[PDB]
Design a protein around this ligand. Structure first.
Ligand SMILES: [Mn+2]
Lengths: 344, 283, 173, 151, 312, 173, 173
């Protein structure tokens, strides 16, 4: 609310909110806020009438309703803005799919149902989840998304940088019956997003979180990759890059495994380090531990690719479902690698 | 009538076994075994029947019609098979023992949990007082053992203590005084608490890495590395063959099942991973 | 907010008037807009003693009372025997809520003794003798909410839903 | 079964990395880590234990410059060559042995306080050597991998 | 009176149609029904009681010529009783108690009600603690290459019980009880086995609450269809309405009849009951009499173990 | 014939005493035999007052009270407020039926009238915090039932079912 | 009030007057489980005197006395100056612990004053010479325990265990 204003008006609204703060008063704090509103009407030369009695009371009553109910009161402009941004993000994702040799079955606004090669699925997931939040570097036709908005030749249309987004991936044999393939895709993307909890901190406190993940499945293997690790998934221009940050790590690691700098034994050798590292309790200890686990399959001479130290302590939970999952994000990273390869 | 008689039999692994399941688990193995509901190694009845039918078709090519009748027909499969196999359930797995006591030397031991024995008794109770073949002694033994659930029990032994699979200390206790052995291989059986027994078991399984080498420059091809999981040699499974009353079912039970010791189960047979000895509980 | 009360609607007509109100508050419990009885109060676990009406409470939740939050004050001569309740008013199981209650209410509820003097056994009963439907419509239903015969030239829909929209569990003990 | 051993190493170890400073008998600890392990199971537990206590300075210095670890804080263990950098290891093994009830404190503390009971302390370790070797294996490989990574 | 069906291994009650390698360039798959349809239990019991000189037409004729009014199936684990519960696309196992407040829960206002039912299907659901789908991939092998045939691969999501599970039916006649005691049967698809133990019991029948739990697919007589699918809110509070097929008849080797039905676990409003009786012709009433003998229209109420047919 | 008693079970240790002497009566219907807390019962439409320990009803099957049926007379100094009724034992809605039905039931129920003063925010809560729950063994499960810890070396599973088999919506105010 | 008493076991037989509760109940700390005399607590840093057999407080750690613990009180003519002390029964250093104890023990050391007259000269003594040990079977065990001579007519058990265990650091002076 206080940020929604542009101009000296923000002072009035935040001091009203302070009058709403801690059940402070009505009919009483309507002076401090008013000794500025009347100041403002006297700050001009042609004002006609003021019923500040009614007006500041209604202005406080608005925010009081907002907070008591607990939701921004929706007006038609809200709906048409969300829907327009939905369609524009859809236009972005249409050429994001086409950027990765994909075939759209249904891409409409919020959702998506495409078919891509098993090779560029991770790239597409990353770039799509970022473009949904208006954060990208490509021109996608006539549309050049810019850090939370959608620039279209000087037109800055909004985006959905607050809305999370889940992702299901089914690595399927071309002879697999599409009935069960589509049903498994839908049932993962439904069950899992409601049923999984992964560690997140907002306000500096390790809490849980449910949506905005990426589930993978390969004929029995499953993995989940959290996409935000922040509950106001972005609130600054800073956190725009944090989106899908775990995915570029998996992409880099797959970039090392292919070129023959790491051996796929990496994907079968993390279990022994996992006991040590999840009971481990210091940062740089676990840092060196993963560095040397990789440095038994080697990544490089004079190692250069470490895991970015935000990935540890992240524990993924599940509400006791047949979907078995490792309780930690790095084991899920390596299962995502197993699932991607298993389809190549 | 309608599964009149039944034949329970032990599946004794002569080599390692690998009945595969694709990549059907969340472990680090890439070619796991076929898993029970409890994550234990099982042999599906489809696999057991398919392997046994294939073997019998090869080594009894004149009895092809009897075998077709009991186990099914390739085409014209509009004639229900009058024989069926239950899922083979792990009955006992060999474990490496570092024993501290008993003055008797043992280097490997058979190991079970109470979940396994519970399912074995489930199979066994559902036959005896229902069908007519009578082997109640085995069921009485399994019930006597199941009495003591919740503590590592040794069977036919004087062990009292041991290291199992080089990694687990356990303290054992004899059953009452003595009991006929459920297996006939003169090796102690241990029934373990369902929690330490499964750690011991999942450390008794063989999980190997395997490699495809570049045929010319003798190096591993990129990505030519995977893992597989074999059930160890000497492992024992348990299944039952249920026969519906018919004439050629008697031919099955008489001419055929009385000359079946060894068959080949599972896959990876060029590695030698399928040889099996079937012991019927009829001796 | 307001206060509402406790009434069973059996084939019995003995519930004519002890709610002394005819207008009440700006909110109205049960409304009727030419579709039948609306905003029915359902009470679970209270057997009835229809003659000598004093609902002895049971324990079995497989009996119910198809009551109404009858508008007003319990005659201000009772409740030394009744029970009474000031609910957060989300707990009342009101059928087909037409309006919207702001979950603020107090309810006085008649009550009785456990009746440990004969083996309890209740029976289900529905509203028989549609003529007695009409006459209970007269005595009790008319003089509480008088919009009937005011705008309602449609009785075939408002007197024949109470046919089976109200069924109870009578003890007869 | 063994999943708190990784938790036990932190507050058992308490320092065999930092206050072991000067990088000679600090890095040397890894030789302990690898070799002793291969020594403990190829050759047995009691041979390696006799070797370790051989290098112990068990006067009171290498009897209290370690039993102080039971109570207070990080013990900078400079002393001399790996005899105090070695009695911390005796401390490590005995710390696992006390925190896992294979041998109690009231004996251990009493066994290392008369030089009459050191002998039967070792004579009792000798009988517990199979069980001990089996049990510490993961707890040791823990600090061996700690050494590979960090030390 | 009560017949406990004890599966000896994972089971397969196939939910869909074709399961066979028809097309060459494609695998086949199948998914098991959590609760076996009553036609399955009926045909099993009949198989146990078969006669060689009756019927041969309209299987339920000579099937019901051997049965009693079988009452729909639920889940008993260890004396505990679980009961299905169905929503839009959802299916949850719950116990006796959690059904009490369900009539009032669905009439709670928007957010309270959705939170309630949503907790009923993701916190109170005991399905995935007792039953999970065990995916079994199988193949066929051509004996010339000792390899797989062309795309002759199939999945089959079986039914794996993490603990002891029985299937519970109630049967009226007792001469049937002591002739199917301790029978090992071929209960379900793809040749799985279960055991039958019978124990005489006692549960009351005549109850009429406002609502009901359907312990079996309520069959709709295809002449009430449009008279049912215009006003769905009048008869079911929550659940699923689905086209089903009555199964597959063995003596004649044909696929049985496709009927609309209200899947088990759906909660029906008492308006349903007479709505059926008043919208069916005597000639169809005679058919649906048998359809109920096998166990298709079975209702329990959310208060007690209230066994109830619909027509009868 | 005997008479039973439906003692409440809140987060509170107000359940240390309900009956004068240890056991008293001849037979009990609720059982603790090796695999479950058998024949427990759940009363609906009510609520528990954790402080001021008695019942404080709130009428809807959404609300419920879980109590055990023991054979004892209530403290000999009350039952001015404790319900004492009698049902045919098939309106006795018992969870986890195992034993014998008596068909002539008599119950005492710890309860106080609502006495409506506060907005009854009635909030449910688990039976957990094992420090709270473990000391309850031999004063709620062996003060009236000496039968346990006599043959039972199976206490922690009939503890597993304690962890869930009690649930309610308390008063909190 | 859990209570116990310490009774040292040398070849010196001066421990047959401080016994009151021979059995007195159903339990001791020390007993016979046909695999040794178990639960033999030992206190460390105390020497015994043969003159007026008791314990004297020494500072040397390994001046230790072995002793039996049984449920007894020294017939309350003693304990005036005996070490009377309540323990947490976890900080007790018992040898051959088999059954651990109830975290509180009113125990009695047979205590002697430091006796600063003589300078202590302690020597470890181990028992032999069965002429002194025959009197133990009746003098200590039969004096106290329950199963005495009912479980041990294979008296070699309590012969070689009494021998190989019960040493002490007396002053020998
Ligand atoms: Mn959804």
């Amino acid at each position: 609310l206080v940020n929604a204003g542009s101009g000296s008006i923000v002072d009035y609204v935040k001091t009203v909110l302070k009058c709403i703060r801690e059940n402070l008063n009505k009919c009483s704090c309507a002076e401090k806020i008013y000794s500025n509103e009347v100041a403002k009407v006297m700050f001009r030369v042609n004002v006609e009438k003021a019923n500040v009695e009614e007006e500041v009371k209604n202005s406080l009553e608005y925010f009081e309703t907002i907070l008591n109910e607990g939701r921004i009161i929706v007006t038609p402009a809200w709906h048409v803005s969300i829907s327009s941004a939905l369609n524009r993000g859809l236009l972005v994702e249409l050429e994001l799919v086409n950027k990765h040799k994909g075939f759209v079955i249904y891409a409409g606004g919020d959702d998506l149902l495409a078919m891509l090669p098993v090779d560029e699925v991770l790239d597409f997931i990353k770039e799509s989840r970022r473009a949904f939040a208006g954060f990208g570097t490509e021109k996608l036709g006539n549309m050049c998304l810019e850090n939370g908005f959608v620039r279209i030749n000087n037109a800055y249309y909004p985006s959905l940088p607050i809305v999370g987004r889940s992702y299901s991936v089914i690595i399927a044999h071309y002879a697999d019956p599409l009935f069960f393939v589509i049903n498994d895709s839908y049932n993962l993307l439904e069950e899992g997003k409601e049923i999984i909890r992964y560690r997140v901190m907002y306000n500096g406190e390790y809490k849980d979180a449910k949506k905005d993940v990426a589930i993978f499945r390969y004929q029995g293997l499953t993995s989940v990759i959290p996409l935000s690790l922040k509950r106001p998934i972005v609130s600054s221009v800073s956190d725009f890059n944090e989106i899908a940050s775990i995915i570029d790590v998996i992409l880099e690691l797959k970039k090392r495994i292919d070129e023959g700098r790491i051996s796929v034994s990496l994907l079968y050798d993390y279990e022994k380090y996992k006991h040590l590292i999840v009971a481990s309790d210091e940062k740089y200890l676990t840092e060196f531990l993963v560095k040397d686990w990789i440095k038994r399959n080697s990544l490089r001479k004079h190692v250069e690719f470490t895991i970015d130290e935000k990935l540890y302590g992240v524990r993924l939970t599940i509400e006791n479902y047949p979907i078995k999952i490792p309780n930690d994000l790095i084991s899920n990273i390596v299962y995502t690698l197993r699932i991607i390869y298993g389809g190549e | 009538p309608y599964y009149a008689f039944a034949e329970p039999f032990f599946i004794h692994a002569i080599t390692h076994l690998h009945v595969g399941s694709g990549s059907s688990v969340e472990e680090e193995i890439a070619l796991p075994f076929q898993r029970d509901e409890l994550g234990y190694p099982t042999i599906y009845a489809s696999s057991l029947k398919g392997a046994i039918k294939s073997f019998l078709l090869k080594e009894f090519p004149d009895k092809r019609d009897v075998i077709y009748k009991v186990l099914g027909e390739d085409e014209n499969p509009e004639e229900a098979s009058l024989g069926t196999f239950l899922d083979a359930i792990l009955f006992a797995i060999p474990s490496r023992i570092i024993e501290i006591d008993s003055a008797k030397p043992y280097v490997w031991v058979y190991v079970t949990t109470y979940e396994l024995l519970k399912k074995v008794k489930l199979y066994l109770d559902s036959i005896s007082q229902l069908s007519n073949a009578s082997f109640s002694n085995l069921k009485n033994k399994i019930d006597t053992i199941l009495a003591k659930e919740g503590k590592n029990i040794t069977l036919d032994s004087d062990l009292k203590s041991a290291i199992l699979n080089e990694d687990f200390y356990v303290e054992l206790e004899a059953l009452n005084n003595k009991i006929p052995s459920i297996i006939n291989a003169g090796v102690p059986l241990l029934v373990l608490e369902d929690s330490i027994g499964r750690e011991v078991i999942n450390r008794s399984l063989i999980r190997v890495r395997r490699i495809r080498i570049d045929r010319d420059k003798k190096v591993v091809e990129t990505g030519g590395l995977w893992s597989e999981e074999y059930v160890p040699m000497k492992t024992i499974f348990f299944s039952v063959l249920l026969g519906k009353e018919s004439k050629e079912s008697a031919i099955f039970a008489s001419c055929i099942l009385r000359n079946l010791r060894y068959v080949i189960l599972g896959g990876k047979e060029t590695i030698g991973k399928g040889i099996v000895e079937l012991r019927w509980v009829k001796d | 907010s307001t206060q509402r009360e406790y009434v069973f609607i059996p084939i019995t007509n003995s519930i004519t008037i002890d709610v002394k109100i005819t207008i009440g508050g700006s909110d109205h419990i049960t409304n009727i807009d030419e579709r039948g009885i609306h905003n029915v109060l359902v009470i679970t676990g209270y057997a009835v003693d229809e003659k000598n009406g004093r609902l002895v409470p049971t324990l079995d939740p497989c009996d119910y009372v198809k009551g109404i939050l009858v508008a007003g004050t319990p005659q201000q001569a009772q409740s030394n025997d009744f029970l009474t309740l000031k609910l957060p008013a989300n707990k009342l199981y009101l059928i087909r809520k037409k309006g919207n209650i702001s979950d603020d209410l107090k309810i006085y509820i008649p009550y009785s003794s456990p009746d440990a003097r004969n083996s309890m056994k209740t029976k289900p009963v529905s509203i028989s003798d549609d003529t007695i439907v009409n006459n209970i419509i007269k005595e009790v239903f008319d003089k509480i909410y008088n919009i009937t015969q005011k705008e309602k030239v449609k009785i075939e829909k408002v007197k024949e839903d109470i046919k089976e929209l109200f069924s109870y569990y009578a003890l007869e003990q | 079964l063994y999943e708190e051993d990784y938790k036990l190493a932190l507050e058992a170890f308490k320092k065999v990395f930092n206050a072991l400073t000067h990088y000679g008998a600090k890095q040397a600890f890894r030789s302990r880590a690898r070799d002793l392990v291969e020594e403990i199971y190829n050759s047995g537990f009691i041979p390696t234990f006799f070797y370790i206590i051989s290098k112990a300075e068990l006067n009171s210095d290498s009897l209290d410059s370690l039993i102080s670890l039971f109570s207070s804080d990080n013990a900078i263990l400079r002393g001399s060559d790996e005899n105090v950098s070695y009695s911390a290891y005796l401390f490590i093994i005995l710390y696992y042995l006390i925190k896992r009830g294979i041998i109690e404190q009231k004996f251990l503390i009493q066994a290392l306080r008369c030089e009459k009971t050191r002998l039967d302390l070792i004579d009792k370790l000798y009988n517990l050597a199979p069980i001990i070797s089996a049990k510490i294996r993961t707890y040791l490989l823990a600090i061996k991998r700690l050494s590979e990574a960090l030390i | 009176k009560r017949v406990l069906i004890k599966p000896l291994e994972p089971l397969m009650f196939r939910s869909q149609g074709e399961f066979e390698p028809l097309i060459t360039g494609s695998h086949t798959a199948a998914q098991s029904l959590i609760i076996p349809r009553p036609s399955t239990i009926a045909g099993m019991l009949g198989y146990i009681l078969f006669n060689k000189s009756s019927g041969t037409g309209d299987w339920l004729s000579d099937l019901t010529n051997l049965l009693a009014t079988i009452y729909g199936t639920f889940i008993e684990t260890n004396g505990e009783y679980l009961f299905p519960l169905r929503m839009g696309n959802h299916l949850a196992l719950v116990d006796q108690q959690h059904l009490i407040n369900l009539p009032t829960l669905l009439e709670k206002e928007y957010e309270r009600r959705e939170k309630g039912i949503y907790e009923l299907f993701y916190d109170k659901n005991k399905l995935f603690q007792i039953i999970n789908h065990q995916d079994r991939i199988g193949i066929s092998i051509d004996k010339s290459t000792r390899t797989v045939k062309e795309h002759y691969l199939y999945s089959a999501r079986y039914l794996a019980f993490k603990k002891e599970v029985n299937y519970v039916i109630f049967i009226d006649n007792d001469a049937i009880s002591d002739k199917i005691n301790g029978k090992i049967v071929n209960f379900g698809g793809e040749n799985r086995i279960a055991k039958l133990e019978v124990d005489d019991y006692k549960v009351d029948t005549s109850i009429e609450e406002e609502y009901y739990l359907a312990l079996s697919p309520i069959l709709i007589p295809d002449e009430a269809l449009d008279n049912f699918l215009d006003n769905i809110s009048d008869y079911v509070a929550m659940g699923k309405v689905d086209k089903i097929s009555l199964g597959f008849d063995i003596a004649n080797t044909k696929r049985k009849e496709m009927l609309t039905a209200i899947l088990e676990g759906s909660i029906v409003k008492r308006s349903i009951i007479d709505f059926i009786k008043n919208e069916i012709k005597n000639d169809l009433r005679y058919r649906f009499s048998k359809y109920e003998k096998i166990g298709y229209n079975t209702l329990m109420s959310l208060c007690k173990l209230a066994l109830r047919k619909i027509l009868s």
